[PDB]
Predict the structure of ecorv endonuclease.
Amino acid sequence: SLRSDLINALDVCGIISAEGKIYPLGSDTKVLSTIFELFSRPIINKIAEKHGYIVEEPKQQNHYPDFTLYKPSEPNKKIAIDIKTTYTNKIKFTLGGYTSFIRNNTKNIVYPFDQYIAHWIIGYVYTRVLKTYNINELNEIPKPYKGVKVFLQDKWVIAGDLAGSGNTTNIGSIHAHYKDFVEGKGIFDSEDEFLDYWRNYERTSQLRNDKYNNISEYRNWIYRGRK
Amino acid sequence: SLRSDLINALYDENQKYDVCGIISAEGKIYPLGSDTKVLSTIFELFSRPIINKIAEKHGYIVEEPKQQNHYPDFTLYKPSEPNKKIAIDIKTTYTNKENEKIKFTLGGYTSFIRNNTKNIVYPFDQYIAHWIIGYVYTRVSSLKTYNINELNEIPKPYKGVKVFLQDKWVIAGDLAGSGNTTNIGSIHAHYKDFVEGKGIFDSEDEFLDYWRNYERTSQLRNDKYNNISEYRNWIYRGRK
DNA sequence: AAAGATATCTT
DNA sequence: AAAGATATCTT
């Protein structure tokens, strides 16, 4: 399938100029996120093409998702792929905001949310370890990571019940080992529960203390009649 | 000076080079996307070696943050004069056409400027200057990988990079650059005004005072000040 | 944990 | 404009 294929298809050491000069990579996530993103684009486009899918990136810069795949024939069977990165020296990711397109069908999203039948997360985890180089020195350039693991999984399967960020209201993923994301050992019973829980999550602790702050509390809140 | 050398070095390097991809230790090159999150990572990468070459030529040691979320990108100083540090942050923004106005986000106004030790590599009071290297690019196949034998084949996602170096306080504006992340917004103007230094604050003390007292929301800024004129009046009356 | 800091963009 | 979106991190 498009899925098993992308998963099968999934060492960068620097940026290069049209004149051959090579600049080394930085050690932070802001840098590795960008790298992994560009590393993945050709892979995604290769596999999508194989399967007759069109790949589309956002024109407005703060729109979800990173990649939108679909066959011009079936407009409502669109797929969303977002690339997430974190490091190790148990990992956790920030999975997008919870007050946007999930609460509002067209808010900050390339196509209306209801046209997307799948929402995949390609996750990269890297283990953390000032001179330009020339093409002939490629093998001596120090890399800013010891290793790199990648996985493809459904967003709902890996989402957790605690916020990933405060002021930028992001969904937190489960806090677990790499295996668990690969295997999909989540906390939510279905994609419907995942969506309901985040559509009703309050922004601050004081506002959540009267509703719920975790999955057990949300279930007891469903019982009380959503009041 | 360190300043004039650095500006010439950046300016020169930018005229002569053109970043077109990321490369693997095995020689495969991946193309660049055309969104600022990417181009700003690239520009910071392109800048590091130059910044270090010039600082070395003047006796300055260069340090990068140990944690993500600590200002600035680069701390320069002499081992003999520790308490005279220089802060440099790289900022990026794009334009849809050359000449049109631009503006940058310049960091929070609720962190180190308000709390001398919050989110900064060294206590705020050890820096004698805060510089900004700004990159402006015009937004503009790129889905396949290339080999070294095709470096000049790979298309670029930008039309005309411009770079400038200027003091933060000089280019800072009076309206916030962001809401939830409480950023200082720069002046909104033409690239020349950034180069020339056509700002709004009279001094670096004014800039810091305006930003140390700027309220987080319109509602609270009603009874205070929402712009430079109002700040001056506020000041005139005794900050009441 | 929860909250807020490093980061630009819309509209 | 202001406010709040796409980025992960730290305490």
User: Anything to note?
Assistant: The two ends of chain A are 43 Å apart (CA to CA).
